Design a protein around this ligand. Sequence first.
Ligand SMILES: OCc1ccc(-n2cnc3ccccc32)cc1
Ligand SMILES: OCc1ccc(-n2cnc3ccccc32)cc1
Ligand SMILES: OCc1ccc(-n2cnc3ccccc32)cc1
Ligand SMILES: *[C@@H]1O[C@H](CO)[C@@H](O)[C@H](O)[C@H]1NC(C)=O
Length: 349
Amino acid sequence: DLRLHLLLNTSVTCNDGSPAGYYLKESRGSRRWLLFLEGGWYCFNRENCDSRYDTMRRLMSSRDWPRTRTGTGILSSQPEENPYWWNANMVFIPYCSSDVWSGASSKSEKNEYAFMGALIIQEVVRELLGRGLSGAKVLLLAGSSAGGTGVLLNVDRVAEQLEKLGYPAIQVRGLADSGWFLDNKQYRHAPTEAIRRGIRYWNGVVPERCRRQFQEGEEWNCFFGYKVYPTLRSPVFVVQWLFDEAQLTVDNVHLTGQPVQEGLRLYIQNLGRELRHTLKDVPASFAPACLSHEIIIRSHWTDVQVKGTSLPRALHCWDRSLHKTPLKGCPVHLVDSCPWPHCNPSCPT
Ligand SMILES: OCc1ccc(-n2cnc3ccccc32)cc1
Ligand SMILES: OCc1ccc(-n2cnc3ccccc32)cc1
Ligand SMILES: OCc1ccc(-n2cnc3ccccc32)cc1
Ligand SMILES: *[C@@H]1O[C@H](CO)[C@@H](O)[C@H](O)[C@H]1NC(C)=O
Protein backbone atom coordinates (compact mmCIF):
# COMPACT_ATOMS: atom_id res chain seq x y z
CA ASP A 1 0.00 0.00 0.00
CA LEU A 2 0.84 3.67 -0.55
CA ARG A 3 0.37 5.84 2.54
CA LEU A 4 -1.22 9.30 2.64
CA HIS A 5 0.75 12.43 3.53
CA LEU A 6 -1.07 15.75 3.67
CA LEU A 7 1.06 18.70 2.62
CA LEU A 8 2.91 20.42 5.45
CA ASN A 9 2.31 23.74 3.69
CA THR A 10 -1.42 23.91 4.35
CA SER A 11 -1.82 26.98 2.10
CA VAL A 12 -1.51 24.68 -0.95
CA THR A 13 -5.07 23.40 -1.07
CA CYS A 14 -7.75 21.44 -2.85
CA ASN A 15 -10.77 23.30 -4.26
CA ASP A 16 -12.47 23.80 -0.88
CA GLY A 17 -9.39 24.89 1.08
CA SER A 18 -8.57 21.52 2.63
CA PRO A 19 -4.90 20.48 2.32
CA ALA A 20 -3.70 18.69 -0.78
CA GLY A 21 -1.42 15.68 -0.43
CA TYR A 22 0.18 12.58 -1.90
CA TYR A 23 0.37 8.81 -1.34
CA LEU A 24 3.88 7.32 -1.06
CA LYS A 25 5.55 3.90 -0.97
CA GLU A 26 9.33 4.12 -0.58
CA SER A 27 11.82 1.67 -2.11
CA ARG A 28 15.10 2.40 -0.33
CA GLY A 29 17.08 0.34 -2.83
CA SER A 30 16.07 2.46 -5.83
CA ARG A 31 17.02 5.86 -7.27
CA ARG A 32 13.95 5.95 -9.57
CA TRP A 33 10.85 7.97 -8.62
CA LEU A 34 7.50 7.77 -10.38
CA LEU A 35 5.02 10.62 -9.70
CA PHE A 36 1.51 9.94 -11.07
CA LEU A 37 -1.18 12.57 -11.70
CA GLU A 38 -4.82 11.45 -11.40
CA GLY A 39 -7.46 12.62 -13.86
CA GLY A 40 -11.19 13.27 -13.86
CA TRP A 41 -12.44 16.06 -16.16
CA TYR A 42 -12.67 19.58 -14.64
CA CYS A 43 -15.07 22.42 -13.84
CA PHE A 44 -15.10 25.93 -15.28
CA ASN A 45 -17.64 28.19 -13.50
CA ARG A 46 -19.35 28.59 -10.13
CA GLU A 47 -22.45 26.60 -11.05
CA ASN A 48 -20.81 23.51 -12.56
CA CYS A 49 -18.16 23.51 -9.81
CA ASP A 50 -20.97 23.52 -7.22
CA SER A 51 -22.46 20.50 -9.00
CA ARG A 52 -19.10 18.69 -8.90
CA TYR A 53 -18.84 19.43 -5.16
CA ASP A 54 -22.04 17.50 -4.42
CA THR A 55 -21.40 14.29 -6.38
CA MET A 56 -17.62 14.22 -7.06
CA ARG A 57 -16.33 15.68 -3.80
CA ARG A 58 -13.19 13.52 -3.55
CA LEU A 59 -11.99 15.45 -6.63
CA MET A 60 -12.45 18.77 -4.76
CA SER A 61 -11.47 18.00 -1.12
CA SER A 62 -9.22 15.84 1.14
CA ARG A 63 -11.92 15.87 3.55
CA ASP A 64 -12.82 12.18 2.99
CA TRP A 65 -9.58 10.62 1.61
CA PRO A 66 -8.53 7.21 2.98
CA ARG A 67 -5.31 6.54 4.87
CA THR A 68 -3.96 4.20 2.15
CA ARG A 69 -4.33 3.24 -1.51
CA THR A 70 -3.30 0.15 -3.47
CA GLY A 71 -0.78 0.70 -6.25
CA THR A 72 -1.95 -0.83 -9.53
CA GLY A 73 -0.53 -1.10 -13.02
CA ILE A 74 2.57 1.05 -13.41
CA LEU A 75 2.21 1.86 -9.69
CA SER A 76 2.32 -1.82 -8.68
CA SER A 77 5.39 -3.08 -6.85
CA GLN A 78 4.88 -6.57 -8.14
CA PRO A 79 6.98 -7.65 -11.14
CA GLU A 80 4.16 -9.86 -12.48
CA GLU A 81 1.87 -6.81 -12.72
CA ASN A 82 4.55 -4.17 -13.49
CA PRO A 83 7.42 -5.46 -15.66
CA TYR A 84 8.70 -1.90 -16.16
CA TRP A 85 9.37 -0.18 -12.81
CA TRP A 86 8.26 -2.57 -10.03
CA ASN A 87 11.15 -1.56 -7.74
CA ALA A 88 10.67 2.21 -8.01
CA ASN A 89 9.59 4.70 -5.38
CA MET A 90 5.84 5.15 -6.03
CA VAL A 91 3.83 8.37 -5.61
CA PHE A 92 0.12 8.91 -6.41
CA ILE A 93 -0.97 12.57 -6.36
CA PRO A 94 -4.78 12.88 -6.06
CA TYR A 95 -6.52 15.33 -8.41
CA CYS A 96 -8.43 17.76 -6.19
CA SER A 97 -8.06 21.05 -8.11
CA SER A 98 -10.45 20.56 -11.09
CA ASP A 99 -8.15 22.65 -13.32
CA VAL A 100 -6.33 20.07 -15.52
CA TRP A 101 -3.36 20.69 -13.18
CA SER A 102 -2.91 24.26 -14.49
CA GLY A 103 -4.15 26.56 -11.72
CA ALA A 104 -2.33 29.03 -9.48
CA SER A 105 -5.10 30.81 -7.57
CA SER A 106 -6.07 30.66 -3.90
CA LYS A 107 -9.40 30.95 -2.15
CA SER A 108 -10.05 34.60 -1.34
CA GLU A 109 -12.72 37.24 -0.80
CA LYS A 110 -13.21 37.11 -4.59
CA ASN A 111 -12.85 33.34 -5.11
CA GLU A 112 -15.24 30.67 -3.80
CA TYR A 113 -12.79 27.92 -4.82
CA ALA A 114 -9.02 27.50 -5.01
CA PHE A 115 -7.43 26.19 -8.22
CA MET A 116 -3.84 25.26 -7.34
CA GLY A 117 -2.94 22.24 -9.49
CA ALA A 118 0.37 23.63 -10.77
CA LEU A 119 1.38 24.59 -7.22
CA ILE A 120 0.33 21.21 -5.79
CA ILE A 121 2.87 19.53 -8.09
CA GLN A 122 5.56 22.05 -7.02
CA GLU A 123 4.89 21.45 -3.31
CA VAL A 124 4.81 17.64 -3.56
CA VAL A 125 8.22 17.75 -5.25
CA ARG A 126 9.65 20.15 -2.65
CA GLU A 127 8.48 18.02 0.28
CA LEU A 128 9.66 14.74 -1.30
CA LEU A 129 13.22 16.09 -1.60
CA GLY A 130 13.54 15.71 2.18
CA ARG A 131 12.19 12.14 1.99
CA GLY A 132 14.79 10.71 -0.40
CA LEU A 133 14.04 12.39 -3.74
CA SER A 134 17.26 14.40 -3.30
CA GLY A 135 19.18 11.25 -4.24
CA ALA A 136 17.16 10.39 -7.34
CA LYS A 137 18.62 9.63 -10.76
CA VAL A 138 15.31 9.81 -12.68
CA LEU A 139 11.98 11.49 -11.87
CA LEU A 140 9.21 10.25 -14.19
CA LEU A 141 6.14 12.51 -14.08
CA ALA A 142 3.23 10.41 -15.36
CA GLY A 143 -0.54 10.84 -15.54
CA SER A 144 -3.79 9.75 -17.16
CA SER A 145 -6.59 11.75 -18.87
CA ALA A 146 -6.55 15.25 -17.29
CA GLY A 147 -3.38 14.04 -15.60
CA GLY A 148 -1.86 13.21 -18.97
CA THR A 149 -2.50 16.74 -20.22
CA GLY A 150 -1.14 17.86 -16.85
CA VAL A 151 2.15 16.11 -17.61
CA LEU A 152 2.52 18.12 -20.82
CA LEU A 153 1.75 21.36 -18.95
CA ASN A 154 4.06 20.78 -15.97
CA VAL A 155 7.05 18.54 -16.86
CA ASP A 156 9.36 21.42 -17.83
CA ARG A 157 8.30 23.40 -14.74
CA VAL A 158 9.41 20.52 -12.51
CA ALA A 159 12.73 20.37 -14.36
CA GLU A 160 13.21 24.11 -13.87
CA GLN A 161 12.25 23.87 -10.19
CA LEU A 162 14.87 21.20 -9.48
CA GLU A 163 17.55 23.14 -11.38
CA LYS A 164 16.75 26.25 -9.33
CA LEU A 165 16.72 24.31 -6.08
CA GLY A 166 20.22 22.94 -6.67
CA TYR A 167 19.54 19.40 -7.97
CA PRO A 168 20.90 19.37 -11.54
CA ALA A 169 21.62 15.62 -11.63
CA ILE A 170 17.96 14.49 -11.41
CA GLN A 171 16.72 13.64 -14.92
CA VAL A 172 13.09 14.76 -15.32
CA ARG A 173 10.96 12.92 -17.90
CA GLY A 174 7.27 12.73 -18.75
CA LEU A 175 4.73 10.00 -19.52
CA ALA A 176 1.42 11.36 -20.85
CA ASP A 177 -1.42 8.81 -21.00
CA SER A 178 -4.73 9.67 -22.73
CA GLY A 179 -4.11 13.42 -22.75
CA TRP A 180 -3.33 14.00 -26.45
CA PHE A 181 -6.43 15.56 -28.04
CA LEU A 182 -7.35 17.08 -31.41
CA ASP A 183 -9.32 20.32 -31.78
CA ASN A 184 -11.29 18.86 -34.68
CA LYS A 185 -14.82 19.43 -35.96
CA GLN A 186 -17.53 17.65 -34.01
CA TYR A 187 -19.67 14.95 -35.59
CA ARG A 188 -22.82 16.76 -34.40
CA HIS A 189 -23.10 20.13 -32.70
CA ALA A 190 -17.73 25.23 -29.22
CA PRO A 191 -15.85 22.76 -27.01
CA THR A 192 -12.66 24.85 -26.84
CA GLU A 193 -14.66 27.67 -25.20
CA ALA A 194 -14.77 25.66 -21.96
CA ILE A 195 -10.93 25.67 -21.86
CA ARG A 196 -10.94 29.29 -22.63
CA ARG A 197 -13.42 29.86 -19.72
CA GLY A 198 -11.50 27.66 -17.38
CA ILE A 199 -8.09 29.26 -17.81
CA ARG A 200 -9.60 32.63 -16.87
CA TYR A 201 -11.56 31.15 -13.94
CA TRP A 202 -8.49 29.27 -12.62
CA ASN A 203 -5.70 31.74 -13.41
CA GLY A 204 -4.31 28.87 -15.44
CA VAL A 205 -0.66 28.72 -16.46
CA VAL A 206 0.95 27.06 -19.49
CA PRO A 207 4.60 26.40 -20.42
CA GLU A 208 6.47 29.61 -21.23
CA ARG A 209 7.78 28.70 -24.69
CA CYS A 210 4.26 27.71 -25.78
CA ARG A 211 2.79 30.88 -24.24
CA ARG A 212 5.30 32.98 -26.20
CA GLN A 213 4.16 31.40 -29.47
CA PHE A 214 0.41 31.84 -29.00
CA GLN A 215 0.48 35.00 -26.76
CA GLU A 216 -2.25 36.62 -24.60
CA GLY A 217 -5.75 35.22 -24.80
CA GLU A 218 -4.71 32.18 -26.83
CA GLU A 219 -3.24 30.03 -24.04
CA TRP A 220 -5.93 27.39 -24.71
CA ASN A 221 -3.78 26.19 -27.63
CA CYS A 222 -1.19 24.81 -25.19
CA PHE A 223 -3.71 22.29 -23.80
CA PHE A 224 -3.43 20.41 -27.12
CA GLY A 225 -0.52 18.01 -27.19
CA TYR A 226 0.46 18.40 -30.83
CA LYS A 227 0.91 22.15 -30.25
CA VAL A 228 2.64 22.10 -26.85
CA TYR A 229 4.89 19.03 -27.33
CA PRO A 230 7.30 20.73 -29.81
CA THR A 231 8.01 23.45 -27.22
CA LEU A 232 9.08 21.03 -24.45
CA ARG A 233 12.66 20.21 -23.58
CA SER A 234 12.24 17.23 -21.25
CA PRO A 235 11.82 13.79 -22.84
CA VAL A 236 8.14 12.82 -23.09
CA PHE A 237 6.59 9.45 -24.00
CA VAL A 238 3.03 9.72 -25.36
CA VAL A 239 0.36 7.02 -24.92
CA GLN A 240 -2.92 7.57 -26.81
CA TRP A 241 -5.67 5.31 -28.12
CA LEU A 242 -6.40 6.21 -31.74
CA PHE A 243 -10.16 6.22 -30.97
CA ASP A 244 -10.16 7.70 -27.47
CA GLU A 245 -13.51 7.72 -25.67
CA ALA A 246 -13.07 11.19 -24.14
CA GLN A 247 -12.17 12.59 -27.57
CA LEU A 248 -15.27 10.96 -29.07
CA THR A 249 -17.43 12.19 -26.19
CA VAL A 250 -16.60 15.80 -26.82
CA ASP A 251 -17.04 15.14 -30.58
CA ASN A 252 -20.63 13.98 -29.81
CA VAL A 253 -20.10 10.43 -31.02
CA HIS A 254 -21.74 7.50 -29.18
CA LEU A 255 -20.51 4.10 -30.48
CA THR A 256 -23.23 2.04 -28.81
CA GLY A 257 -25.99 1.42 -31.34
CA GLN A 258 -25.24 -1.37 -33.84
CA PRO A 259 -25.51 0.18 -37.39
CA VAL A 260 -22.81 2.71 -38.38
CA GLN A 261 -23.64 4.56 -41.62
CA GLU A 262 -21.29 6.11 -44.20
CA GLY A 263 -20.96 9.58 -42.69
CA LEU A 264 -19.93 8.27 -39.28
CA ARG A 265 -17.63 5.63 -40.79
CA LEU A 266 -15.71 8.33 -42.66
CA TYR A 267 -15.62 10.54 -39.55
CA ILE A 268 -14.14 7.75 -37.41
CA GLN A 269 -11.58 6.76 -40.05
CA ASN A 270 -10.48 10.38 -40.55
CA LEU A 271 -10.04 10.83 -36.79
CA GLY A 272 -7.66 7.88 -36.56
CA ARG A 273 -5.66 9.08 -39.56
CA GLU A 274 -5.37 12.60 -38.13
CA LEU A 275 -4.19 11.27 -34.76
CA ARG A 276 -1.66 9.03 -36.54
CA HIS A 277 -0.37 12.10 -38.39
CA THR A 278 0.16 14.16 -35.22
CA LEU A 279 2.37 11.38 -33.78
CA LYS A 280 4.56 10.86 -36.82
CA ASP A 281 7.41 13.03 -35.46
CA VAL A 282 6.98 11.84 -31.85
CA PRO A 283 9.80 9.28 -31.42
CA ALA A 284 8.56 7.80 -28.10
CA SER A 285 4.89 6.86 -28.46
CA PHE A 286 2.40 3.99 -28.10
CA ALA A 287 -0.87 4.42 -30.03
CA PRO A 288 -3.11 1.37 -30.51
CA ALA A 289 -6.15 1.29 -32.80
CA CYS A 290 -8.71 0.79 -30.04
CA LEU A 291 -11.82 2.47 -28.65
CA SER A 292 -10.98 2.93 -24.95
CA HIS A 293 -9.80 5.45 -22.35
CA GLU A 294 -6.79 5.50 -19.98
CA ILE A 295 -4.19 2.74 -19.90
CA ILE A 296 -1.38 2.89 -17.35
CA ILE A 297 -2.74 2.24 -13.82
CA ARG A 298 -5.04 -0.66 -14.71
CA SER A 299 -3.89 -4.08 -13.57
CA HIS A 300 -3.97 -5.68 -17.05
CA TRP A 301 -2.10 -2.86 -18.78
CA THR A 302 0.51 -5.38 -19.96
CA ASP A 303 -1.88 -7.15 -22.35
CA VAL A 304 -2.06 -4.61 -25.21
CA GLN A 305 0.57 -4.84 -27.97
CA VAL A 306 1.41 -2.82 -31.08
CA LYS A 307 3.37 -4.66 -33.79
CA GLY A 308 4.01 -7.38 -31.19
CA THR A 309 5.44 -5.07 -28.49
CA SER A 310 3.75 -4.28 -25.17
CA LEU A 311 3.73 -0.90 -23.43
CA PRO A 312 5.97 -2.06 -20.53
CA ARG A 313 8.50 -3.23 -23.14
CA ALA A 314 8.29 0.05 -25.06
CA LEU A 315 8.92 1.99 -21.84
CA HIS A 316 11.94 -0.20 -21.05
CA CYS A 317 13.28 0.48 -24.55
CA TRP A 318 12.79 4.20 -23.91
CA ASP A 319 14.90 3.90 -20.74
CA ARG A 320 17.67 2.23 -22.77
CA SER A 321 17.49 4.93 -25.45
CA LEU A 322 18.13 7.59 -22.79
CA HIS A 323 21.34 6.02 -21.48
CA LYS A 324 20.43 8.68 -31.42
CA THR A 325 20.69 5.25 -33.03
CA PRO A 326 17.69 2.90 -32.62
CA LEU A 327 17.99 -0.36 -30.71
CA LYS A 328 17.90 -3.85 -32.20
CA GLY A 329 14.57 -5.48 -31.39
CA CYS A 330 13.62 -2.89 -28.75
CA PRO A 331 11.43 -0.23 -30.38
CA VAL A 332 10.10 3.03 -28.95
CA HIS A 333 7.79 4.41 -31.71
CA LEU A 334 4.71 2.17 -31.93
CA VAL A 335 1.65 3.51 -33.80
CA ASP A 336 -1.00 1.29 -35.39
CA SER A 337 -1.76 1.78 -39.08
CA CYS A 338 -5.02 -0.19 -39.34
CA PRO A 339 -8.03 2.12 -39.71
CA TRP A 340 -10.91 0.85 -37.46
CA PRO A 341 -11.50 0.21 -33.74
CA HIS A 342 -10.20 -3.07 -32.53
CA CYS A 343 -8.47 -3.96 -35.79
CA ASN A 344 -5.65 -4.70 -33.36
CA PRO A 345 -6.61 -8.05 -31.74
CA SER A 346 -5.07 -7.08 -28.37
CA CYS A 347 -7.47 -4.19 -27.64
CA PRO A 348 -9.23 -4.27 -24.24
CA THR A 349 -12.51 -6.14 -24.39
O1 LIG B 1 -19.97 10.90 -20.18
C1 LIG B 1 -20.77 12.05 -20.38
C2 LIG B 1 -19.95 13.31 -20.49
C3 LIG B 1 -20.29 14.28 -21.41
C4 LIG B 1 -19.54 15.43 -21.53
C5 LIG B 1 -18.45 15.63 -20.70
N1 LIG B 1 -17.69 16.83 -20.84
C6 LIG B 1 -17.41 17.45 -22.03
N2 LIG B 1 -16.69 18.53 -21.89
C7 LIG B 1 -16.48 18.67 -20.52
C8 LIG B 1 -15.80 19.65 -19.81
C9 LIG B 1 -15.76 19.54 -18.43
C10 LIG B 1 -16.38 18.48 -17.77
C11 LIG B 1 -17.05 17.50 -18.46
C12 LIG B 1 -17.09 17.61 -19.85
C13 LIG B 1 -18.10 14.67 -19.77
C14 LIG B 1 -18.85 13.51 -19.67
O1 LIG C 1 -17.58 17.88 -13.32
C1 LIG C 1 -18.17 19.12 -13.67
C2 LIG C 1 -18.86 19.06 -15.00
C3 LIG C 1 -18.88 20.16 -15.84
C4 LIG C 1 -19.50 20.10 -17.08
C5 LIG C 1 -20.13 18.93 -17.47
N1 LIG C 1 -20.79 18.83 -18.73
C6 LIG C 1 -21.89 18.05 -18.98
N2 LIG C 1 -22.31 18.13 -20.21
C7 LIG C 1 -21.43 19.00 -20.85
C8 LIG C 1 -21.40 19.43 -22.18
C9 LIG C 1 -20.40 20.30 -22.55
C10 LIG C 1 -19.45 20.74 -21.64
C11 LIG C 1 -19.47 20.33 -20.32
C12 LIG C 1 -20.48 19.45 -19.94
C13 LIG C 1 -20.13 17.84 -16.63
C14 LIG C 1 -19.49 17.90 -15.41
O1 LIG D 1 -12.61 20.06 -30.96
C1 LIG D 1 -12.46 18.82 -30.28
C2 LIG D 1 -12.08 19.00 -28.84
C3 LIG D 1 -11.41 18.01 -28.15
C4 LIG D 1 -11.07 18.18 -26.81
C5 LIG D 1 -11.41 19.35 -26.17
N1 LIG D 1 -11.10 19.54 -24.78
C6 LIG D 1 -12.02 19.91 -23.83
N2 LIG D 1 -11.51 20.02 -22.64
C7 LIG D 1 -10.15 19.75 -22.79
C8 LIG D 1 -9.13 19.74 -21.85
C9 LIG D 1 -7.85 19.44 -22.27
C10 LIG D 1 -7.59 19.14 -23.61
C11 LIG D 1 -8.59 19.14 -24.55
C12 LIG D 1 -9.88 19.44 -24.13
C13 LIG D 1 -12.10 20.34 -26.84
C14 LIG D 1 -12.42 20.17 -28.18
C1 LIG E 1 3.37 27.73 1.07
O1 LIG E 1 3.10 27.75 -0.29
C2 LIG E 1 2.71 29.04 -0.76
C3 LIG E 1 2.22 28.86 -2.18
O2 LIG E 1 3.26 28.38 -3.02
C4 LIG E 1 3.90 29.98 -0.65
O3 LIG E 1 3.47 31.28 -1.00
C5 LIG E 1 4.46 29.99 0.77
O4 LIG E 1 5.75 30.59 0.75
C6 LIG E 1 4.60 28.59 1.37
N1 LIG E 1 4.81 28.68 2.81
C7 LIG E 1 5.95 28.35 3.42
C8 LIG E 1 5.96 28.52 4.91
O5 LIG E 1 6.92 27.93 2.80
